[PDB]
Amino acid sequence: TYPVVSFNKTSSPELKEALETLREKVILPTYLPPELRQKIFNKKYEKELAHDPVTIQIDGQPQRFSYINMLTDMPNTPKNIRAALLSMKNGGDFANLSGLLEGMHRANRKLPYWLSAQIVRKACKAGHLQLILNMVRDVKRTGFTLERHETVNELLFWIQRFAWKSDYSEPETRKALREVQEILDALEGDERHMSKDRKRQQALTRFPYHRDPQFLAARLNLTAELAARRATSEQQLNSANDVKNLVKYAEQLVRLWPADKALLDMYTDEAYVARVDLRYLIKPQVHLRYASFTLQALKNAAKIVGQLGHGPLAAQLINRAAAVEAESQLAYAKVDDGMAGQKIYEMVVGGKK
Amino acid sequence: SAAELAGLPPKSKQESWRRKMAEARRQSLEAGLQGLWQRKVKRDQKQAKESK
């Protein structure tokens, strides 16, 4: 069905070393039938393979497969992925994650739960957001499921940051708001993103990802940045239309989000205990990271909704913002000078720049 | 059925049909066994009566 995994673009030589190792011993063997794949890892057939090694009609050229000691010759998949990941400083380099995670999905390699959040961080800080959303869209092949609650909170963060970087320009904001809805529709509709781990995290938070106030607040941010610009008939229709979605989403977030409850109190108190789910939020360095856009959203949202003549919502949204701002200010007094969280929050909410 | 001995209504359309067909087979077996039993008794008496 799909083309065989291949890597033909590597800027540094160390990168190629990590990929060629996995490709020839962890990904390529999977393309063999169940019969032959059991011969490579057998000592009884070592003597035979040395004479007539196995071959496959890959792109015409016949491949080769000799004996491979399962205990010694096999490489360490986590380390190799980490080495390959750190050695990525080019567009063509990060384009290999689509093939890398594909082969790992074929090899049934249970990668670290936190790996998804790491790939989204390094790949997005270099300007390769589309290569990520392409994998999330092509989940049937790359296996880049949105399992972790952090991966969803890490991805939505960058989507908002890319738009915020250019002062929320209409051309990109219109495109950025499409990507957010592309995810919220995938978490609900698409079934590839549903797994046992996600069933546990949702049970602790009592909110499904597509109805989690932490994620919905991202959709309310970009929306609030569309009505602020305008509030030419074709363009005037979109502005008036966005005012309906704002009051619609703003009225939905207040319902789910309880009263006077900050980010660390939204979910149940039993979720912040386990480290395999919803514990990154405890560290102030990470809290300020996801508490900046969600905070600025409520402020900018409560403002517009106040101009339209909605008293209740104005007081409601300001209630949450005051609760998150107070909690956010606390974390700002404990974060170490130089950490990413202190810089992001200082640039977004503080507006220093 | 346990759901029938408790006096509960049928779950769906099919459950009601099965309840009726099962009873039709329950009453038919009773009237069949008893009906055929009287035939044998009435037949054995005639033979013994005449043979006597």
């Binding site: 529709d185 609900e188 509709g189 499904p208 109805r211 789910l256 | -």
Partner: protein, 191 residues
């Protein structure tokens, strides 16, 4: 005695009915002068008109009796049809603060789902929402995100007759073998 059912919006006239049920029954669309002649004519009368073979006459009488009982095929419960083309749309709701019930309803092409009243929106049977903006169901071609249409096609409601691939279970090896022989001869002749 012979009650006649009212024409529905999806099946307004006879040519539409005979087209849906397929089986090449649209030949005799002219035999029936009106809609009331289809459900009135008898077996013997249809035999005099020319409705043959008997398989087509007995098959038409079946879909005839099946129409009186409201046992329509697919897309028969539609109400908002325009020139044999319908339009489906998704109607979202809020069953709970964390769930959403989506139903494939039938509304005019121009009007929006929420704008239509409760009694005007009709839920079509056999069509569901797989996901959040995809309409799944037989003969549901997509028009937009969350919008599909139903075009009146031939054989839409027909009961497909079985066929044999290459003579069935008994005479199958014999058919394939001869076909192969002809191909090889042609290739040798061509070379």
């Amino acid at each position: 005695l012979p009650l006649i059912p009212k024409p529905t919006p999806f099946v307004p006239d006879v040519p539409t009915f005979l087209t849906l049920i397929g089986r090449d029954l649209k030949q005799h669309a002219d035999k029936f002068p009106t809609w009331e002649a289809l459900f009135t004519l008898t077996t013997d009368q249809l035999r005099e008109l020319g409705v043959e073979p008997p398989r087509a006459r007995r098959y038409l009488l079946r879909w005839r009796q099946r129409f009186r009982e409201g046992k329509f095929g697919i897309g028969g419960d539609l109400k908002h049809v325009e020139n044999g083309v319908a339009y489906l749309k998704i109607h979202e709701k809020e069953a709970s603060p964390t769930r959403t019930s989506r139903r494939v309803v039938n509304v005019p092409a121009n009007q929006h789902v929420e704008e239509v009243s409760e009694g005007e929106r009709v839920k079509v049977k056999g069509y569901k929402v797989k996901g959040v903006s995809t309409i799944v169901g037989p003969y549901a071609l997509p028009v937009q995100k969350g919008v599909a249409k139903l075009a009146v096609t031939e054989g839409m409601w027909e009961d497909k007759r079985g066929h044999k691939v290459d003579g069935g279970e008994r005479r199958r090896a014999e058919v394939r073998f001869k076909r192969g022989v002809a191909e090889r001869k042609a290739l040798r002749e061509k070379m």
